[PDB]
A paper describes a structure:
[name] is a promiscuous transferase that glycosylates bioactive hydroxycoumarins such as scopoletin and umbelliferone, as well as monolignols involved in lignin formation and various other small molecules. Five distinct GT protein folds have been identified that are capable of GT activity (termed GT-A to GT-E). [name] adopts a GT-B fold comprised of two distinct N-terminal and C-terminal Rossmann-like domains (shown in cyan and brown in Fig. 2, respectively) of seven and six parallel β-sheets, respectively linked to α-helices, connected by a linker region and an interdomain cleft. The catalytic mechanism of inverting UGT such as [name] is a direct displacement bimolecular nucleophilic substitution (SN2)-like reaction enabled by an enzymatic base catalyst.
Moreover, [name] crystallized in the presence of scopoletin (III), UDP (IV), and a mixture of scopoletin and the non-transferable donor UDP2FG (V). Complex V and IV represent the SI and product-inhibited enzyme complexes, respectively, as they were obtained in the presence of an excess of substrate (scopoletin) and product (UDP), respectively. Asn372, Ser373, Glu376, Arg249, Ala351, and Trp350 frame their donor binding sites and in both structures, the indole ring of Trp350 points in the direction towards the uracil structure of UDP2FG and UDP, resulting in a π-stacking interaction. His18 is 4.0 Å apart from O7 of scopoletin in complex V and presumably plays the role of a catalytic base for the deprotonation of the acceptor to allow the nucleophilic attack at the anomeric centre of the donor. In [name], Asp118 is located at a distance of 4.8 Å, while Tyr317, an amino acid of the closing loop, is only 2.8 Å apart. The product inhibited protein structure IV and SI complex V show closed active sites with distinct electron densities for the residues from 310-326 in IV and V, while catalytically active VI and VII lack electron densities for this region due to the high dynamics and the loop may remain open. The non-productive complexes IV and V are compact, fully resolved, and display a closed active site. Phe53, an amino acid of helix H2, interacts via π-cation binding with Arg214 of the UDPG-binding pocket and approaches Trp350 4.1 Å in SI complex V and 4.0 Å in the product-inhibited structure IV, while the distance is larger in all other structures. Although a ternary dead-end complex V was identified in our study, it differs from the previously postulated dead-end complex in that UDPG and not UDP is bound. Structures III and VII differ both in the length of helix H2 and in the spatial orientation of Trp350, leading to the formation of an unproductive SI complex V and a catalytically active complex VI, respectively, after binding of the respective second substrate.
Author numbering: 3 to 477
The structure:
């Protein structure tokens, strides 16, 4: 049983860097493996760096070591209109020569390479050194089913996916409304559509796929991935639901937001955040402002400067301070009026400490998967406000299938959410009986997910499975 060494590669972002850090911690801790993390990082991030601090010094004895990898300049392959998907692909691709050397320099060669959903293009580095290779899909199995099967849809739709009148039926799974298609499928003539479709096929060339979900949450989709005849003509490797994997709450006391929360009533605060990436569009930010206020509900609202372009176009940076005081893009005297009723928090906040707090009763989220899982594992119900990526599909699951979120009658992206509607949703969630029923569903998923990670039970075992697969391949 000589000790394993697993390297994990992370694409730039935060939704991407975090679940890797978590995953590495999970393995190093519970399954006595040596982890090394190759975190690719466009050093324009601020958050990423400060993050990477409060972890490496918490993971010294832990036998985790984080090697950061700076992405090369890709400004010669992009413009104002190149998407975040494509950017991300190109960064990792251009970084591939660097990883290559980084492994080669390692003394203890890794026995297994686990790569992010965006580092699928590192396959060759593992193929070269003849190491086991797995990809880590940090989101829903439903989206992984879409990716995989998308190579088929590509060859039997013709027109645009958004123009379709019938839903796209992934074999064996929940049918996808044309409106809830992930960003890359919104336009077929775009570079990211072909990148997406390549991603789908790249998944099949790994030795297995880790997913940040659990059997109890999305049963059918996983069963479809394992046994569905049409799908399995395409997939042909193990899946490993190892979730839900989230960060620990760190006992940080000097935080002001917390000190504000300590003065509040239980389950009395709506928490608002559009994740690490997302921004609102000035009008939507205004309507949201009035929503919170008309609601007469206590709130914490992480706000960032609005933009009437793409919500996600910030995604890559996150290290720009600028000269626009938050009181610019908020309504006149908003922080005067709402003081003692809410908290506007610029740029960033301690999301896991917040969501774990007694006074937080609700969460208006963008439906990123790590945010969602942070919500569900604290049994916090949610307002579903998808902006980009696969969040439309996640919101679809959370509202329709799992029943732990509410949402506006039209997608925010498709039409403005007026302040009345917002106020309405906030009151529903926080203060109506429907509110409390949704909260209970959330608390049941909380317990579900507790059993998933407890010894025995789905996700724990799927790790022991993965490790056994590694150790058999060591052949
Ligand atoms: O103020 C803040 C805001 C966020 N965070 C943390 O950063 C992560 C962002 O949440 P989420 O996974 O939804 O991230 P995001 O990168 O926006 O989503 C993309 O990346 C995700 C990949 O996991 C994907 O699911 C999604 O569809 C993509 F759009 C998550 O771990 C939060 O706890 C924080 O600490 N403080
Ligand atoms: C635009 O950005 C993203 C798009 C998708 C689409 C499908 C998926 O399974 O994951 C994604 C992760 C992303 O960061």
């Amino acid at each position: 049983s000589s000790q394993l060494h697993v390297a994990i590669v992370s694409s730039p972002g935060m939704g991407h860097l975090i679940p890797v850090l978590v995953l590495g911690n999970r393995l190093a801790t519970h399954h006595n493996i040596k982890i090394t993390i190759l975190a690719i990082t466009t050093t324009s991030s601020s958050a990423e760096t400060e993050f990477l601090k409060k972890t490496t010094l918490t993971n010294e004895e832990k036998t985790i070591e984080i090697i950061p990898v700076p992405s090369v300049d890709i400004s010669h392959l992009i413009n104002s209109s190149t998407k975040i998907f494509t950017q991300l692909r190109l960064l990792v691709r251009e970084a591939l020569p660097k990883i290559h050397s980084t492994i080669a320099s390692m003394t203890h060669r890794p026995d297994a390479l686990i790569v992010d959903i965006f580092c699928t293009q590192i396959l060759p580095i593992a193929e070269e050194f003849n190491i086991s290779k797995y990809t880590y899909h940090p989101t829903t199995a439903w989206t992984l089913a879409l990716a995989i099967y998308c190579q088929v849809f590509d060859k039997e739709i013709e027109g645009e996916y958004v123009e379709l009148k019938e839903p796209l039926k992934i074999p064996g799974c929940k049918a996808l409304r044309p409106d809830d298609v992930v960003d890359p499928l919104l336009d077929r003539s775009d570079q990211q559509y072909e990148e997406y479709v390549k991603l789908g096929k790249e998944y099949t060339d790994f030795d297995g796929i880790l997913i940040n979900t659990w059997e109890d949450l999305e049963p059918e989709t996983i069963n479809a991935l394992r046994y569905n005849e049409k799908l399995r003509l395409l997939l042909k490797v193990p899946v490993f639901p190892i979730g839900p994997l989230r960060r620990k709450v760190e006992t940080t006391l000097n935080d002001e937001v917390i000190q504000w929360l300590d003065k509040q009533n239980n389950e009395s605060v709506l928490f608002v955040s559009f994740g690490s990436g997302g921004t609102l569009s000035t009008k939507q930010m205004t309507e949201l402002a009035w929503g919170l206020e008309l609601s007469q509900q206590k709130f914490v609202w992480v706000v960032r400067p609005p933009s009437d372009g793409d919500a996600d176009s910030a995604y890559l940076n996150s290290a720009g301070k600028d000269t626009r005081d938050m009181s610019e893009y908020l309504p006149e005297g908003f922080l005067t009026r709402t003081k003692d009723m809410g908290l506007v928090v610029p740029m960033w906040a301690n999301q896991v400490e917040i969501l774990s707090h007694s006074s937080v009763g609700g969460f208006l989220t963008h439906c990123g998967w790590n945010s969602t899982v942070e919500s569900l594992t604290n049994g916090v119900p949610m307002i579903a406000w998808p902006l980009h990526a696969e969040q439309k599909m996640n919101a679809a699951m959370l509202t329709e299938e799992l029943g732990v979120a509410i949402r506006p009658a039209v997608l925010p992206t498709k039409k403005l959410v007026k302040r009345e509607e917002i106020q309405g949703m906030v009151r529903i969630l926080m203060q109506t009986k429907e509110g409390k029923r949704i909260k209970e569903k959330a608390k049941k998923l909380k317990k579900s997910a507790e059993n998933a990670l407890s010894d025995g039970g789905s996700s724990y075992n799927s790790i022991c499975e993965l490790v056994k697969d590694i150790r058999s391949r060591e052949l």
